[PDB]
Amino acid sequence: LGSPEFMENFQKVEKIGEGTYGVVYKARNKLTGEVVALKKIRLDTETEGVPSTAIREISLLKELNHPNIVKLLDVIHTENKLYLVFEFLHQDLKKFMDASALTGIPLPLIKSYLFQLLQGLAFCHSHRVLHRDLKPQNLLINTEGAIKLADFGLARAFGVPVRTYTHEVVTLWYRAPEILLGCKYYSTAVDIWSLGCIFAEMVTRRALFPGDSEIDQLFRIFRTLGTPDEVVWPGVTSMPDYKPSFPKWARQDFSKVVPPLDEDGRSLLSQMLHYDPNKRISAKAALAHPFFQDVTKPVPHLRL
Ligand SMILES: Nc1nc(Nc2ccc(S(N)(=O)=O)cc2)sc1C(=O)c1ccccc1[N+](=O)[O-]
Secondary structure (H helix, E strand, O other), X not given: OOOHHHHHHEEEEXXXXXXXXXXXXXXXXXXXXXXXXXXXXXXXXXXXXXXXXXXXXXHHHHOOOOOOEOOEEEEEEEOOEEEEEEEOOOEEHHHHHHHOOOOOOOHXXXXXXXXXXXXXXXHHHHOOOOOOOOOHHHEEEOOOOOEEEOOOXXXXXXXXXXXXXXXXXXXXXXXXXXXXXXXXXXXXXXXXXXXXXXXXXXXXXXXXXXXXXXXXXXXXXXXXXXXXXXXXXXXXXXXXXXXXXXXXXXXXXXXXXXXXXXXXXXXXXXXXXXXXXXXXXXXXXXXXXXXXXXXXXXXXXXXX
């Protein structure tokens, strides 16, 4: 199958980055002038082709309609490639945080971004959609002050892994503890954990739990939040990958974790990082938190 109209009209302007299963580019329509982001996925064609299950999941994502979610414009299968075409935004949150090294990020902007991300997540969760892969590079910002959720993860990946991608370990940094301990089905709480890690990263300008392996990821979480036990997390000791031999670290206070964040922010962050998924705050309850009583929509000073 070929899609020659799309292929000839759109020209790659630059490569944005790589991911486990796709390469991302900025492309510009030769005809109009429209710019989009393209995710190019190479298909196996021997074992998978375009899986039907994947097409149904992608179709569901394409129907997601919310201002804080990047719009999937089209899906194009051509040759042995699948291209996902997205609404283009100019910068991701990782680049913005790096660019803010000498200036810091104003608290009102951090609060606005967290509020917007929670609105996008509350919306998705209410429609039975999990993001599953929240990290700074998957959060996009525009000059008007908006931030949007991008690169939603599928329940089942497909395509040939990108050999030039070497940053897979970063995905562990935002992974909820229940996933690391072996849960089978992810709940909406996994996205709140990832967003909590990102909130701490916006405030401190350093990743909260930068593990170098799955066990190191778990131990970095334990070193800060304390090794979980049956009191703080009922049922934890029975999880598939839980080991009685885990070292027992005592919990640290959030005042040392995200200085100089205010008490409202620390309270919210602590609820987003609760060990027990059943007690972790929901996106909706988070929107209702006192931290957001004075939220506004400032604009970033983007240099592009
Ligand atoms: N829509 C959209 N816009 C982008 N622009 C952008 C422009 C500049 C930068 S940067 N490093 O700050 O200069 C980063 C992103 S990426 C993107 C995505 O939808 C996307 C995002 C993450 C992973 C995969 C995809 N993806 O599948 O297309």
